[PDB]
Design a protein around this ligand. Sequence first.
Ligand SMILES: *C[C@@](*)(O)[C@H](Cc1ccccc1)NC(=O)[C@H](C)NC(=O)[C@H](C)N
Length: 224
Amino acid sequence: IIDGAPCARGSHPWQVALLSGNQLHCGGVLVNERWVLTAAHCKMNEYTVHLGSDTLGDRRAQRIKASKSFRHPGYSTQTHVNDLMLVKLNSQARLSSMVKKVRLPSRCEPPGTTCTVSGWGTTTSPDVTFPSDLMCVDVKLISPQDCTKVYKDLLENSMLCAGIPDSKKNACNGDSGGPLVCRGTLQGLVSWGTFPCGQPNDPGVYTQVCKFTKWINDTMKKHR
Ligand SMILES: *C[C@@](*)(O)[C@H](Cc1ccccc1)NC(=O)[C@H](C)NC(=O)[C@H](C)N
C-alpha cells in the first residue's frame, strides 16, 4: 500500500495472506470456513494462508495450507480480465473474534463512493519495503468513462477503478487479492496498475465483485 497507514487492529477479520513458506505473495479475503477469494494471477501450486492477525508471523494467527484453487474460466493471463480465483483450505478455518467472513455485495456501488483497500504489499516503489503490519488507505471509485481516458483498451466491463486525483494513494506489489470495501460490502479485489506504483492520476484497477457473486456461489457448491 502506498501513502497509507497501519489499519486499526481487529478491523479486518476477513483479510488473509497467501505465503510461500514464510514470504508474502499476495492477499485475499475469507468467504467462509473453507473458502478464500483472491486474484487469479496469484496462482500457486501450494499456499500457506495466514488468518486472524494484522501482523505477519503473529504467534496467535492461524496458518492453514491449501492445495486446490479455482480460477474464473474467463480469466486471461494476458489481459488479466476476470482476475479472480477461489482457494480451498485443506482444513476449515476456525471462526473467532479475529476471523470472520466478508460481506459480499448484493449491489454495485456508483462512482464517488468512498472505499478502503488494505494489504501487506510494499509501501514503496520502485524501491521495495514490506511491512509486518497490515496497511490501509482511502480511495474513491472512478467511473468507467473516466478510467477509460487513462487505460483505454486495457479495460473491460468487469473491471472497477478507484483512487484519488493527483494523489499517490494506491496498491502495489504484494496487494493482489486484497479487498476494496465500500459502504460495508466487498466491492473489489486488487488487480493491476502502473509501475512504479503510486503514479498520480493513474487509478488502481480492481475486480468488480458485484458481478461474480453468482460464480462464487456456484463454484463453492460445485466443489463443496
Ligand atoms: C499480483 C498482484 O500482486 C499485483 C498487484 C499490483 C502490483 C503493481 C502495481 C499495482 C498492483 N498485480 C500484478 O502484478 C499486475 C499484473 N501488475 C501490473 O500492475 C502490471 C505490471 N501493469
